[PDB]
Design a protein around this nucleic acid. Structure first.
Ligand code: DTP
Ligand code: MN
Ligand code: MN
Length: 430
DNA sequence: ATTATGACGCT
DNA sequence: AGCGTCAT
């Protein structure tokens, strides 16, 4: 009844850039604009690996993780932009700096949580309360929501997509009761108005387009954002959840895309998120543990409480490189050379970070992978990070890993290393 | 030879 | 702490 929490206390948005690395390259090179194009790293092995794809190219079936040579088979006129290489490795600085552009604009509207290089969550609860006050009981015009979808609408008693968007929007608005300053649906709508403003600002000031989801929590906001990309935003109301989840594969929900989600499906013998409602909290806790069980019980009802953390900057700064196949490092000075290259990029990014953000990393994590292992990281060791100097860091990294070498000979490295990883962690204010 | 990251959970 | 999971 009225005691039952419905998880409608917050207004949360997720803003995610469209085809982000592609857009970064398209802004820089006008020739790539409005074309099937993709961003690739490296070149020698099968044309390089694709990590971002324009929507024009997606129509041909081009995807992430596809080799460029294979993508060219689906899309002969596919244009390609290469990730910069520095010190023998891919360097993502251009995209990180483009990310900062967007993050700083979003921060003008509310405190954000950086969730990836191209997306951030927004807690709009306070901002919505203040827009509602200066509205002072005026209806929200559809003109204020020019790119907004309302999930689940229209319904009941039409052949074009923009026409459908508007029909759904008018059904939504004409059902809104704005007399109520605590109405969750009204609060979401105002949230959507603000996000329209945010997204306009991002495009105006960077040239980048993005999509967004507006709901009552992070999981629903993330799900919403993807429903109508690119260059659109979607509102998922609490009321839309039963229909939405009744046919929603469990793997589509954030954190359930892996082994846990597979276990939910296998153990319970279900396919869709909505089917979870038929289990007690204790039942779910028994199968998936106390934390996961409570989380699942609430989530399948559209309820989740993970807060938007006040964190705009990444907590770690890392440098990594794979050495696949026959390129695996088999000599000590090979290992030492590449540790230096990684450490030099790390020092560069660390020094920039210290100046920009008034902080200093205090711990260096070293990770390697060995030939034969299917694990991402065969070993992780930490040591102290007392100075921002590449030679010191690479020498220290070598020290903490050098006895991983099985080889009785000290000049040769056995078994060959197929990955190196340097990560600066544990920041302190400075 | 699906690369380069980055956050959070478990024990 | 070191490892595993999930993620973009
Ligand atoms: N697995 C990955 N490996 C390396 N880089 C990645 C990977 N996934 C994503 N990226 C980079 C490239 C992307 O442009 C950027 C944003 O990722 P993501 O939001 O998932 O897709 P996207 O922005 O390229 O397209 P869209 O969000 O419109 O579907 O992060
Ligand atoms: Mn994106
Ligand atoms: Mn993203």
């Amino acid at each position: 009844g009225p005691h039952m929490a419905t998880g409608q206390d917050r207004v949360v948005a997720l803003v995610d850039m469209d085809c982000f690395f592609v857009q970064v390259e398209q802004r820089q090179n006008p020739h790539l604009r409005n074309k099937p194009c993709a961003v690739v790293q490296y070149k020698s092995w099968k044309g390089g690996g694709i990590i971002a794809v324009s929507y024009e190219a997606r129509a041909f079936g081009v995807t992430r993780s596809m080799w460029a040579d294979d993508a060219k088979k689906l899309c002969p006129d596919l244009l390609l932009a290469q990730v910069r290489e520095s010190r023998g490795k891919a360097n993502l600085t251009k995209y990180r700096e483009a990310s900062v552009e967007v993050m700083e604009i979003m921060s003008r509207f509310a405190v954000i949580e950086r969730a990836s290089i191209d997306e951030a969550y927004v807690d709009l609860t306070s901002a919505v309360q203040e827009r509602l006050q200066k509205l002072q009981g005026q209806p929200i015009s559809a003109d204020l929501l020019p790119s907004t979808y309302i999930e689940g609408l229209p319904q009941g008693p039409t052949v074009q997509k923009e026409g459908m968007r508007k029909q759904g929007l008018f059904q939504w608005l004409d059902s809104l009761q704005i007399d109520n300053l605590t109405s969750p649906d009204l609060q979401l709508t105002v949230g959507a108005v603000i996000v329209e403003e945010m997204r306009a600002a991002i495009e105006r000031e960077t040239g980048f387009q993005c999509s967004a989801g507006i709901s009552h929590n992070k999981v629903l906001a993330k799900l919403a954002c993807g429903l109508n990309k690119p260059n659109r935003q979607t509102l998922v109301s609490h009321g839309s959840v039963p229909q939405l989840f009744s046919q929603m594969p469990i793997r589509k929900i954030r954190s359930l895309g892996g082994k846990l989600g597979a276990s939910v499906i296998e153990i319970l013998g279900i396919e869709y998120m909505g089917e979870l409602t038929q289990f007690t909290e204790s039942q779910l806790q028994s199968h998936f543990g106390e934390k996961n069980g409570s989380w699942l019980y609430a989530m399948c009802r559209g309820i989740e409480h993970d807060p938007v953390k006040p964190r705009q900057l990444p907590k770690t700064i890392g440098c990594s490189k794979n050495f696949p196949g026959k390129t695996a490092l088999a000599t000590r000075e090979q290992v030492q050379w590449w540790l230096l290259q990684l450490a030099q990029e790390l020092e560069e990014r660390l020094t920039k970070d210290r100046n920009d953000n008034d902080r200093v990393a205090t711990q260096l994590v070293v990770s390697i992978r060995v030939q034969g292992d299917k694990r991402l990281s065969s070993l992780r060791r930490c040591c102290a990070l007392t100075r921002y100097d590449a030679h010191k860091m690479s020498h220290d990294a070598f020290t903490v890993i050098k006895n991983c070498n099985t080889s009785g000979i000290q000049t040769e490295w056995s078994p060959p290393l197929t990955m190196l990883f340097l990560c600066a962690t544990k920041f302190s204010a400075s």
